[PDB]
Design a protein around this ligand. Structure first.
Ligand code: THP
Ligand code: CA
Length: 129
């Protein structure tokens, strides 16, 4: 895989972010994770985590996997990086997302994220508390 540029348009919630990619606005859904909805427990906190992460970053990047790049709702599916740090993984490491939606096409970083989840679980972090 490789990183490609994008600029933040707007944080949306824990695992969705509006970004400009190849000069077009689009909503990205983070691969391999599931944050709770804003209305659920840790939802506000997930949204807050992702927001600060992408808003503070001098450089946002987008990384498509090998399978499909758009989901059935037209959302981009990618690993998103903030100054080189992966938002998907960072959420999971903090117990603010579960590893989820692991489809055979698009799972390059599954084991990395599962390793993070294990550590979050060990620490009884947030969702795991
Ligand atoms: C993360 C991800 C979600 N989706 C779809 C499956 C789920 O469909 P349904 O909406 O029919 O449940 C939905 C989960 O997104 P949210 O967790 O953002 O709701 O998005 C994919 O198709 N591919 C993916 O990689
Ligand atoms: Ca969600």
């Amino acid at each position: 895989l490789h990183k490609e540029p994008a600029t933040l348009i707007k944080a949306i919630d824990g695992d969705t972010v509006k970004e400009m990619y190849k000069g077009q606005p689009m909503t990205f859904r983070l691969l391999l994770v599931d944050t709770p909805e804003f209305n659920e427990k840790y939802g506000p906190e997930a949204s807050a985590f992702t927001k600060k992460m992408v808003e503070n970053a001098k450089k946002i990047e987008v990384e498509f996997d090998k399978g499909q790049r758009t989901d059935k709702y037209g959302r981009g599916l990618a690993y998103i990086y903030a100054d080189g740090k992966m938002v998907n993984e960072a959420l999971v490491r903090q117990g603010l997302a579960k590893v989820a939606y692991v489809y055979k096409g698009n799972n390059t970083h599954e084991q990395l994220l599962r390793k993070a989840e294990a550590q979050a679980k060990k620490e009884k972090l947030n969702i795991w508390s």
